[PDB]
Design an enzyme around this catalytic site. Structure first.
Site, mmCIF file in Angstrom:
data_model
loop_
_atom_site.group_PDB
_atom_site.id
_atom_site.type_symbol
_atom_site.label_atom_id
_atom_site.label_comp_id
_atom_site.label_asym_id
_atom_site.label_seq_id
_atom_site.Cartn_x
_atom_site.Cartn_y
_atom_site.Cartn_z
ATOM 1 N N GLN A 8 -53.186 -21.099 -19.403
ATOM 2 C CA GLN A 8 -52.262 -22.090 -19.926
ATOM 3 C C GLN A 8 -50.876 -21.846 -19.355
ATOM 4 O O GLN A 8 -50.504 -20.716 -19.026
ATOM 5 C CB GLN A 8 -52.210 -22.033 -21.451
ATOM 6 C CG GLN A 8 -53.519 -22.275 -22.151
ATOM 7 C CD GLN A 8 -53.371 -22.270 -23.657
ATOM 8 O OE1 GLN A 8 -52.308 -21.956 -24.191
ATOM 9 N NE2 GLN A 8 -54.442 -22.624 -24.353
HETATM 10 N N1 LIG Z 1 -71.079 -27.001 -15.899
HETATM 11 C C1 LIG Z 1 -70.445 -25.736 -15.604
HETATM 12 N N2 LIG Z 1 -69.469 -25.201 -16.546
HETATM 13 C C2 LIG Z 1 -68.797 -23.904 -16.284
HETATM 14 C C3 LIG Z 1 -69.091 -23.203 -15.151
HETATM 15 N N3 LIG Z 1 -68.366 -22.090 -15.144
HETATM 16 C C4 LIG Z 1 -67.617 -22.076 -16.259
HETATM 17 N N4 LIG Z 1 -67.898 -23.200 -16.947
HETATM 18 C C5 LIG Z 1 -67.552 -23.942 -18.205
HETATM 19 O O1 LIG Z 1 -66.392 -24.524 -18.080
HETATM 20 C C6 LIG Z 1 -65.574 -24.315 -19.472
HETATM 21 C C7 LIG Z 1 -64.329 -23.517 -19.230
HETATM 22 O O2 LIG Z 1 -64.639 -22.158 -18.935
HETATM 23 P P1 LIG Z 1 -63.654 -20.982 -19.603
HETATM 24 O O3 LIG Z 1 -64.143 -19.573 -19.170
HETATM 25 O O4 LIG Z 1 -63.685 -21.080 -21.143
HETATM 26 O O5 LIG Z 1 -62.088 -21.212 -19.078
HETATM 27 P P2 LIG Z 1 -61.038 -19.996 -18.722
HETATM 28 O O6 LIG Z 1 -61.208 -19.591 -17.327
HETATM 29 O O7 LIG Z 1 -61.287 -18.839 -19.618
HETATM 30 O O8 LIG Z 1 -59.503 -20.529 -18.979
HETATM 31 P P3 LIG Z 1 -58.893 -20.658 -20.489
HETATM 32 O O9 LIG Z 1 -59.401 -19.423 -21.331
HETATM 33 O O10 LIG Z 1 -57.331 -20.600 -20.425
HETATM 34 S S1 LIG Z 1 -59.411 -22.290 -21.280
HETATM 35 C C8 LIG Z 1 -66.350 -23.671 -20.292
HETATM 36 O O11 LIG Z 1 -66.995 -24.631 -21.210
HETATM 37 C C9 LIG Z 1 -67.402 -22.985 -19.403
HETATM 38 O O12 LIG Z 1 -68.577 -22.844 -20.077
HETATM 39 C C10 LIG Z 1 -70.113 -23.757 -14.152
HETATM 40 O O13 LIG Z 1 -70.368 -23.132 -13.151
HETATM 41 N N5 LIG Z 1 -70.766 -25.009 -14.401
#
Ligand SMILES: Nc1nc2c(ncn2[C@@H]2O[C@H](COP(=O)(O)OP(=O)(O)OP(O)(O)=S)[C@@H](O)[C@H]2O)c(=O)[nH]1
Ligand SMILES: Nc1nc2c(ncn2[C@@H]2O[C@H](COP(=O)(O)OP(=O)(O)OP(O)(O)=S)[C@@H](O)[C@H]2O)c(=O)[nH]1
Ligand SMILES: Nc1nc2c(ncn2[C@@H]2O[C@H](COP(=O)(O)OP(=O)(O)OP(O)(O)=S)[C@@H](O)[C@H]2O)c(=O)[nH]1
Ligand SMILES: Nc1nc2c(ncn2[C@@H]2O[C@H](COP(=O)(O)OP(=O)(O)OP(O)(O)=S)[C@@H](O)[C@H]2O)c(=O)[nH]1
Ligand SMILES: Nc1nc2c(ncn2[C@@H]2O[C@H](COP(=O)(O)OP(=O)(O)OP(O)(O)=S)[C@@H](O)[C@H]2O)c(=O)[nH]1
Ligand SMILES: Nc1nc2c(ncn2[C@@H]2O[C@H](COP(=O)(O)OP(=O)(O)OP(O)(O)=S)[C@@H](O)[C@H]2O)c(=O)[nH]1
Ligand SMILES: Nc1nc2c(ncn2[C@@H]2O[C@H](COP(=O)(O)OP(=O)(O)OP(O)(O)=S)[C@@H](O)[C@H]2O)c(=O)[nH]1
Ligand SMILES: [Mg+2]
Ligand SMILES: [Mg+2]
Ligand SMILES: [Mg+2]
Ligand SMILES: [Mg+2]
Ligand SMILES: [Mg+2]
Ligand SMILES: [Mg+2]
Ligand SMILES: [Mg+2]
Lengths: 163, 163, 163, 163, 163, 163, 163
Positions: free
Chosen positions: B56
């Site tokens: 964020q």
């Molecule tokens: N369809 C799909 N979804 C993915 C993949 N890799 C990660 N995600 C999905 O995308 C969403 C975001 O991943 P997330 O790990 O929660 O974000 P972040 O990198 O931690 O960043 P944040 O915490 O500031 S929101 C999640 O719902 C996760 O399950 C992928 O390879 N394919």
């Protein structure tokens, strides 16, 4: 391992309720805070020592006794109270200019979001002039101390500024 | 025997999912990362200590607390998000100029390759300006944290830069 | 009693196959080498410790981490690949000028001789400019890692440069 | 054991590419050089410290800060650019008259020989008025920084003027 | 290792925004600069200490307190403001004649290039009479402090005039 | 080791341009010279200290302040200006009769030879009555301050009259 | 690190209120200032020592005891009082001619802007003859001591004239 916090704000905001929702887990009945409350709460292997203080106009002049050795600050603002958002801005811009709180991390609990007339965290971020902050890390979270929402997500951010 | 890693990127990239796919082996449900997660994972007789952080806009300014003593960096980029590939380029070119990350190895997880509209690793290598890197080793791998593809091939490359 | 070796070359050459034909005796299926493999093989009362590394363009810049304390080098070249014999010459003439490999013995495995279009060891000796070597001992052997031919005749030559 | 070098020339010549072909071994993507790059490269037990600088008209006036304690100079000229060979002659005849570069060795990289319209090293030797040099050792080499040709033959000549 | 800078210009130019885009990486909301801001930013192993000052007519007479011991100057000019380009020329020609800034390096940030009506850096170079500068090194860069473009290319040029 | 020079001529000749082509190497934009410019330029282990002055009719009467201790004079004449070659002859024959410039060496820069209508150095030598000089060494060189031609060949001749 | 200030003005202006709005943060009830008040206030790592004095006609003759060693002056003027703006002009033009306040910085608090009949800062700048000031830096700010507006923007300007 340790961290010191100062919860402040205007009267009616939700400071005591937040503190004893973090410490006990229950919503206690409250009396106006003439003196001060102090409580240690553990989370993520960190022991935050929170000092809740009064917001009455007569106690807002005694907050200076606590600025020293304070590593984080939690400014609680009542969102339903849209008529005192300017007074809170004055208080916060005054307390951001103090040199004892020069390195303190800033967190803002926009409380009372369960109320229908509550104002969004972005509207508060605009009204409080938070983007004007440049010498300090800052963050704003939307809460509901009666339900605990957004409270453990503030202590989580305060961990970023550990040691 | 040991190694320290910093996983970073924009919001929605896949950092937490990657970390808890390496550590647990299962795809967990996720909440936005306000604070930080830290986990040790063993592989090839090496114990990587990964620090996943928030993306964020408000937490991107707190990453500096972690640059110190960091031996590798893992920049995760969402490939489906073709509208924010410029913002990621800004963030990465800013964080490549910091002097605390002067010797850090660079790895890039182009995640979300399972999606049909995903963009190739070469298109990302061109859009991110990765060939412009000259003071640093770097590498780009195509992944799918939900299926684990390409994740153990990044820790394998990070081993090249041990000690 | 001991000896350290570094197997290197371009991608597709046969390094991993050679290593795990010497170590196990069987032809294994292979994946691209992103990191590194290390294996000890005993022969003639000598324990060679071979480090096989990647040949992809992105890993050719990480070979420097291994030049130190290296007593022998094994450059594997694909003979069927007659279009990349110039790139291998560039890589080898660059790595012969490094000062960490100043005393290293040079061995060249001209692999994939079982293929009909394979090029002779003398044609490779001419194309690689091996007679131009003057500060170093060198040797070229024709191999077939799938059948083991010429592999135990290279470790036999490396024994000449013991201690 | 040590040597200091100054790579200079007009814009578009190939200075940065030459430097990071000597230092890394790979052809990097490039941005205009507003400031300066500095890199140490080892060869023949000698550690050359090369300073690549900008060639834009606005930076050609800041080269004087680097003339001091400079033991060799490398003037890179684009051979395909046959319309600016007079401007390079002006720059070089001006910089040969400076007293801080009074003992400096002169090397000339006639780069971009891979292009069909490239001009020979003798045509450049005539156009640049290099035989007119009398107070200085000089040498001209034909190069191709993208392929590395002629680059290690310039550092080899610079060794003649050691100490 | 160290360097002192003075950012100046007319009101509305972008000085504070540039400074806190270099220091923090984010675009902050701004208030008119009545006093002064001072911030240290690290880049290329150099620690620039930038002093941003007011541009209001009443503070333009207090800049003299800062001329002393100033090693570089950054004149920010709003390109969209094509009606005040003469006032900036007056200010700059006055401040170039001061003897305390006799050796100072001159950099010019032609800011607000993201706006459609913005004027080119060459049109500004002509309107400001920059080629008339003869006792001083100078340089002009086109920027967009909101996006960070051209900001790290100015600190890169200021490095040329180190020590 | 040292030498003092006085550059003079009519208005529009090229004095300032010559001086800041010798000193900086670039062609600067110019303003009429009301006062005087002074600059030291090094060449052949000699440090010439050149004083460029105004040529307007009102400043031609202030040149006398500079005649003293002047070891060389550089008279610049515009060749394209074929209508004022008589006025220059008057000025030069007047300034050759002054007793403070009794031993001064005379050099004549016939500038603006790049223009098509320019007049040869011999036509100028005839029109200026230079062969009539008998108490003084003299020399005439054809120049182009915009390109630097003939400028370093005048300082070369002035060296003949050192000490 | 330190600074000395003298707050002065006519009776009814707002001096005491300003001082104890800066020092305490609250609007105190007030009594006429027969003697003097002195208070230290910290801001921007600077400790201003403010001396508020009486404005009654009988105390205006005792201000001279405080002129010495005074580094800044704050003239407070009531804007609603449009009938005494001439008396304030007399007082200020008299106190600008004193030699003990020869280097003092001048700040003008046009107070009581919250009142409807208040007069603009430019109307006051014209009525007070502030542009006539030539031996002194000066500045005028519009305030409201009851609300704190414009008070921390005056101490910010006084910082410009530090040391
Ligand atoms: N369809 C799909 N979804 C993915 C993949 N890799 C990660 N995600 C999905 O995308 C969403 C975001 O991943 P997330 O790990 O929660 O974000 P972040 O990198 O931690 O960043 P944040 O915490 O500031 S929101 C999640 O719902 C996760 O399950 C992928 O390879 N394919
Ligand atoms: N409906 C609602 N009430 C809340 C919420 N958060 C706090 N409060 C209520 O608002 C009232 C004021 O909270 P309180 O904690 O006592 O004020 P304070 O911050 O301590 O300030 P004071 O001690 O100077 S009076 C309390 O009755 C409390 O229960 C909320 O999210 N929703
Ligand atoms: N037909 C034939 N195939 C061979 C021979 N030697 C090696 N190979 C085959 O060629 C392929 C490439 O060999 P491999 O060992 O995987 O490449 P590498 O040297 O490790 O390089 P890389 O890891 O960067 S992809 C493999 O399929 C291997 O089985 C040979 O002598 N004959
Ligand atoms: N086709 C070809 N391109 C070359 C060759 N040598 C250098 N270049 C290319 O020409 C371009 C200019 O080279 P570059 O190194 O960036 O200029 P410079 O010397 O640094 O000057 P500058 O930084 O002031 S823009 C680059 O795109 C580079 O890749 C060559 O031998 N053949
Ligand atoms: N649209 C756009 N706005 C910019 C740009 N650069 C700066 N600004 C904006 O223009 C406004 C003025 O910038 P600012 O930094 O506050 O002025 P200043 O240089 O500090 O001068 P001052 O303090 O005396 S008011 C700000 O709202 C700022 O955000 C740009 O590149 N594009
Ligand atoms: N086309 C051309 N212009 C030249 C040449 N040499 C000088 N100039 C130009 O002629 C103009 C006059 O030169 P300048 O140096 O300013 O006059 P001056 O000698 O200093 O005399 P002044 O200061 O009393 S106005 C300038 O615009 C200059 O650029 C030349 O060789 N060719
Ligand atoms: N309505 C309003 N009243 C103000 C304002 N600023 C100051 N005052 C009020 O005006 C009155 C005079 O202010 P005060 O500070 O007591 O005068 P003084 O400057 O100290 O001068 P004196 O001590 O010789 S009587 C006070 O009642 C004060 O509260 C303002 O901005 N708005
Ligand atoms: Mg309370
Ligand atoms: Mg996350
Ligand atoms: Mg392999
Ligand atoms: Mg370059
Ligand atoms: Mg500003
Ligand atoms: Mg002139
Ligand atoms: Mg009073």
């Amino acid at each position: 391992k340790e961290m010191r916090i100062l919860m402040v704000g205007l009267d009616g905001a939700g400071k005591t309720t937040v503190l004893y929702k973090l410490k006990l887990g229950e919503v206690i009945t409250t009396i106006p805070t003439i003196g001060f409350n102090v409580e240690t709460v553990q989370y993520k292997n960190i022991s935050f020592t929170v000092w809740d203080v009064g917001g009455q106009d007569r106690i807002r002049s005694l907050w200076r006794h606590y600025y020293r050795n304070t590593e984080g600050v939690i400014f609680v603002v009542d969102s339903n109270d849209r008529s005192r958002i300017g007074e809170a801005r004055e208080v916060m811009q005054r307390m951001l200019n103090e040199d004892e709180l020069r390195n303190a991390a800033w967190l803002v609990f926009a409380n009372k979001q369960d109320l229908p007339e509550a104002m969004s965290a972005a509207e508060i971020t605009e009204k409080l002039g938070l983007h004007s902050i440049r010498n300090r890390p800052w963050f704003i979270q939307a809460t509901c101390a009666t339900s605990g929402e957004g409270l453990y997500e503030g202590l989580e951010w305060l961990s970023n500024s550990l040691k």
